[PDB]
Amino acid sequence: APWATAEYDYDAAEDNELTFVENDKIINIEFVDDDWWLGELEKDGSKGLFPSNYVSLGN
Protein backbone atom coordinates (compact mmCIF):
# COMPACT_ATOMS: atom_id res chain seq x y z
CA ALA A 1 0.00 0.00 0.00
CA PRO A 2 2.36 2.78 -1.31
CA TRP A 3 1.54 6.43 -1.85
CA ALA A 4 1.93 8.50 -4.99
CA THR A 5 2.15 12.07 -6.24
CA ALA A 6 -0.14 13.71 -8.78
CA GLU A 7 1.56 13.93 -12.15
CA TYR A 8 -1.38 15.68 -13.85
CA ASP A 9 -4.65 17.15 -12.63
CA TYR A 10 -7.45 14.54 -12.74
CA ASP A 11 -11.06 15.53 -12.44
CA ALA A 12 -13.47 12.85 -11.33
CA ALA A 13 -16.37 12.33 -13.70
CA GLU A 14 -18.08 9.79 -11.44
CA ASP A 15 -19.14 9.60 -7.80
CA ASN A 16 -16.63 6.82 -7.05
CA GLU A 17 -13.71 8.70 -8.66
CA LEU A 18 -11.19 10.89 -6.85
CA THR A 19 -10.67 14.49 -7.90
CA PHE A 20 -7.19 15.92 -7.37
CA VAL A 21 -4.62 18.35 -8.72
CA GLU A 22 -0.99 18.01 -9.76
CA ASN A 23 1.24 17.48 -6.72
CA ASP A 24 -1.49 16.18 -4.45
CA LYS A 25 -0.57 12.93 -2.72
CA ILE A 26 -2.74 9.81 -2.99
CA ILE A 27 -2.14 7.34 -0.17
CA ASN A 28 -2.96 3.71 0.66
CA ILE A 29 -3.08 2.75 -2.97
CA GLU A 30 -4.78 -0.57 -3.63
CA PHE A 31 -4.03 -2.41 -6.86
CA VAL A 32 -7.67 -2.67 -7.91
CA ASP A 33 -6.97 -2.74 -11.66
CA ASP A 34 -3.81 -2.51 -13.82
CA ASP A 35 -4.91 0.90 -15.15
CA TRP A 36 -6.97 2.38 -12.35
CA TRP A 37 -6.21 2.11 -8.65
CA LEU A 38 -8.24 2.90 -5.58
CA GLY A 39 -6.70 5.29 -3.08
CA GLU A 40 -7.28 8.09 -0.62
CA LEU A 41 -6.28 11.74 -0.76
CA GLU A 42 -3.72 12.90 1.75
CA LYS A 43 -5.34 16.32 1.85
CA ASP A 44 -8.88 15.38 2.86
CA GLY A 45 -9.34 11.65 3.46
CA SER A 46 -11.63 11.18 0.42
CA LYS A 47 -11.36 7.78 -1.26
CA GLY A 48 -12.06 6.58 -4.76
CA LEU A 49 -10.86 5.30 -8.08
CA PHE A 50 -8.08 7.15 -9.83
CA PRO A 51 -6.32 6.53 -13.14
CA SER A 52 -2.77 5.29 -12.73
CA ASN A 53 -1.31 7.26 -15.63
CA TYR A 54 -2.03 10.46 -13.64
CA VAL A 55 0.27 9.59 -10.70
CA SER A 56 3.80 8.44 -9.95
CA LEU A 57 4.64 6.39 -6.83
CA GLY A 58 6.53 8.29 -4.14
CA ASN A 59 7.95 11.81 -4.31
Side-chain angles (χ1 to χ4, degrees):
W3 59 268
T5 41
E7 293 176 313
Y8 300 87
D9 182 346
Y10 174 74
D11 288 348
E14 293 174 0
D15 275 358
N16 291 341
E17 293 175 357
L18 289 168
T19 301
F20 54 77
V21 292
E22 191 186 352
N23 294 323
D24 286 347
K25 291 181 177 178
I26 294 85
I27 73 171
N28 300 323
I29 296 168
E30 291 174 8
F31 291 92
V32 174
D33 176 65
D34 56 326
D35 188 25
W36 289 70
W37 291 321
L38 178 57
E40 181 182 17
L41 298 187
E42 176 201 20
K43 72 191 184 179
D44 66 13
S46 60
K47 298 191 187 199
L49 291 171
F50 66 88
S52 304
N53 51 326
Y54 283 69
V55 298
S56 175
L57 303 190
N59 243 329

